Amino acid sequence: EEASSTGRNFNVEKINGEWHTIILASDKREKIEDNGNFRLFLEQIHVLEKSLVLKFHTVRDEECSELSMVADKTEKAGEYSVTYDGFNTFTIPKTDYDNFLMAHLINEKDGETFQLMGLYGREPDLSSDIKERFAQLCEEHGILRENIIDLSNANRC
Numbered sequence: 719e720e721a722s723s724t725g726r727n728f729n730v731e732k733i734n735g736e737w738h739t740i741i742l743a744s745d746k747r748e749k750i751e752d753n754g755n756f757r758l759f760l761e762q763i764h765v766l767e768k769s770l771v772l773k774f775h776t777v778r779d780e781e782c783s784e785l786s787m788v789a790d791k792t793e794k795a796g797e798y799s800v801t802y803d804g805f806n807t808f809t810i811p812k813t814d815y816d817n818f819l820m821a822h823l824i825n826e827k828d829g830e831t832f833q834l835m836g837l838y839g840r841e842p843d844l845s846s847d848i849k850e851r852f853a854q855l856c857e858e859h860g861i862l863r864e865n866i867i868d869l870s871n872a873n874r875c
């Protein structure tokens with residue numbers, strides 16, 4: 719079964735646990751390229767009453783560095799916010815809890831904005847079919863495939 723965080727049947731406790739960044743996408747590609755601040759490798763999500771504790775690592779010159787963030791529920795169901803290189807809000811438009819999680823994020827920094835979409839997997843990679851469903855979701859948000867970067871061959875330290 720699948721759900722959206724904004725849906726009535728969403729069960730947030732079920733996204734708790736291990737995750738891996740499989741693909742990242744953005745309508746401002748530089749943000750997720752090699753030295754971009756948003757090329758974040760998710761490791762785990764800890765679900766709390768009114769927040770999600772997100773654990774990631776970033777890479778630079780082949781060197782990993784850990785980073786944690788706390789995302790707070792906003793006033794709209796299924797939406798969370800977190801301060802990181804500007805102000806961010808995000809939702810989970812689609813997840814099946816056991817294999818994949820697709821997130822949509824809006825960043826606002828210095829009066830600007832951009833969209834980021836992420837495909838996370840319970841294992842370090844996902845099937846080609848789920849990767850295609852992610853490309854379709856990116857298309858629905860006006861993000862071209864050439865702005866979608868598969869990081870499954872670079873998500874481990």
Ligand SMILES: CCCCCCCCCO
Binds near residue numbers: 834836
């Ligand atoms: C559901 C938790 C993941 C939300 C998306 C975070 C994106 C970070 C920038 O890559």
